[PDB]
Design a protein around this ligand. Structure first.
Ligand code: 5OD
Length: 485
């Protein structure tokens, strides 16, 4: 993911492509003219083209292109399909997990001693740098990194174009001390795990200017999304193409929900754009993250709910937003009964609350009375069209009610969560739910690691949690939950 430059202007991007690139060279960067937006800068016929990528929270929407779950998925699509031929690699180490810019040696030794383990390492500024590694069961070793005539070295041997190239080389070819100690660079020092009780302190520190600390942390998490390019073959099958709301936003094959007992006369009846999400990766405290139904996928949706024994559905979109259909109406009007293929649904009662509507549904298979179960649909109706709510209170009160409903039901299957694409708002609600559940069981004195949790959810469905605004909202929601305990 070296084609992503987090700190360059459009002029710097043009100058980089015109002087260090060739026709077909490209890079992506965050927008400066509209923070929250991105730009794909591409060299074609000796000139540079700047293409806008927008993300208001649901997907990356490339101008003159398609809608994607991650920037890595976007780039992989066009590199395997204006030509994107040559990534122009970024030498900036700001978004590396192990880079701690202006941090002192005293503080760095305190962090490796209190939070490190064998092979924990960090790189900090001295124009020179220091590589600090903990080894043992123990001790801290400091390796001086010289910057001489724009290249990096540890005092001998090879000279690197970037700290990234230097760190990767010494991860592959470890330094050995003359008495035998292997300076193993096993893992970056963990600085994001916090005690839940100290959430306020961390939010305060992250709200300070780095763009704030939140931006730096979120972009270091995005840098790791190239580790998550898992296969999505099933969603690409001709037979499944029109079952996807967005052509290129697909479920990973390894976690997709497989639909069994399909119409024997239907060649492909096992697909739905949905993934099982398991915390720390029981059916009960698991989730199904899915897209908003299409008219042709309503029956598949109900086959999924029935098969998985799901008793709670969380809908985080209106049916229509900004004049566009985000989810078809897959449930009957209040008091009505409808058949969706082999599935029969009665809408028993609707209850309106400030931020949401609850629909008590009875789902059963046609011809089998004894299969009836109640499915509780919580429909969050006040999420803004773009961005996130200004206050997490409403979302928390809603999740608290959803949690208690699910907890009250013996052997309930995973909670189904959906929005439009099923990755932005969906991923945001699931992550908040996972984090608050840890504070429920383990109490205020528990460890929480927001980016670790999100990377874990993102390994089960593409792009869960889309934006820096949602990333900050997750911290704000955890903070508010702890503050009202
Ligand atoms: C100051 C700095 N340059 C930015 C903040 N920082 C970190 C570190 N680690 C993560 C992390 C944690 C768990 C899983 C994943 Cl995948 C990630 Cl990437 C993160 N998001 N930010 C430290 C370096």
């Amino acid at each position: 993911r070296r084609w992503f430059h987090p700190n360059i202007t459009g002029v710097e991007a043009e100058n980089l492509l015109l002087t260090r690139g060739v026709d077909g060279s490209f890079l992506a960067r965050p927008s400066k003219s509209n923070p929250g937006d991105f730009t794909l800068s591409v060299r074609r016929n000796g000139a540079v083209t700047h293409i806008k990528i927008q993300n208001t929270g649901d997907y990356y929407d490339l101008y003159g292109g398609e809608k994607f779950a991650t920037l890595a998925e976007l780039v992989q699509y066009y590199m395997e399909h204006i030509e994107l031929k040559y990534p122009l690699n970024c030498a900036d180490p700001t978004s590396e997990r192990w880079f701690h810019g202006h941090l002192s040696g005293k503080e760095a030794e305190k962090l490796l001693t209190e939070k490190g383990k064998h092979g924990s390492f960090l790189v900090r500024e001295s124009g020179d740098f220091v590589l600090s590694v903990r080894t043992g069961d123990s001790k801290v070793t400091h390796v001086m990194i010289r910057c001489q005539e724009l290249k990096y070295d540890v005092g001998g041997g090879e000279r690197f174009d970037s700290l990234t190239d230097l760190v990767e080389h010494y991860k592959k070819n470890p330094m050995v001390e003359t008495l035998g100690t292997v300076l193993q660079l096993k893992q970056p020092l963990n600085t994001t795990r916090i005690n839940a009780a100290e959430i306020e302190s961390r939010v305060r520190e992250l709200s300070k200017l780095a763009k704030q600390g939140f931006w730096e942390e979120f972009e270091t998490l995005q840098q790791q999304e190239c580790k998550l390019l898992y296969s999505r073959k099933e969603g690409q099958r001709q037979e499944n193409k029109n079952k996807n709301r967005y052509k290129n936003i697909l479920p990973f094959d390894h976690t997709r929900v497989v639909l069994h007992d399909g119409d024997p006369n239907e060649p492909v009846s096992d697909y739905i754009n949905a993934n099982i999400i398991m915390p720390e990766f029981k059916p009960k405290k698991s989730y199904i993250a899915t897209q908003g139904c299409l008219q042709n996928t309503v029956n598949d949706f109900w086959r999924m709910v029935f098969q998985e024994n799901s008793r709670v559905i969380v809908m985080t979109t209106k049916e229509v937003e900004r004049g566009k259909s985000k989810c078809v109406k897959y449930w009957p009007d209040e008091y009505a009964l409808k058949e969706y293929g082999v599935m029969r649904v009665r809408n028993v009662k609707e209850s309106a609350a400030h931020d949401y509507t609850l629909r008590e549904l009875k789902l059963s298979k046609v011809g089998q009375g004894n299969t009836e179960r109640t499915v509780w649909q919580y429909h969050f109706r006040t999420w803004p069209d773009h961005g996130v709510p200004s206050d997490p209170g409403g979302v928390l009160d809603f999740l608290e009610e959803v949690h208690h409903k699910q907890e009250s039901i013996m052997d309930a299957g995973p909670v189904v969560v959906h929005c439009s694409a099923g990755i932005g708002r969906t991923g945001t609600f699931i992550v908040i739910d996972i984090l608050i559940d840890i504070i429920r069981e383990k109490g205020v004195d528990c460890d929480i690691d927001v980016p670790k949790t999100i990377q874990m959810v993102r390994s089960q469905r593409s792009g869960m949690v889309q934006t820096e605004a949602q990333y900050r909202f997750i911290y704000m929601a955890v903070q508010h939950y702890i503050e009202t305990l």
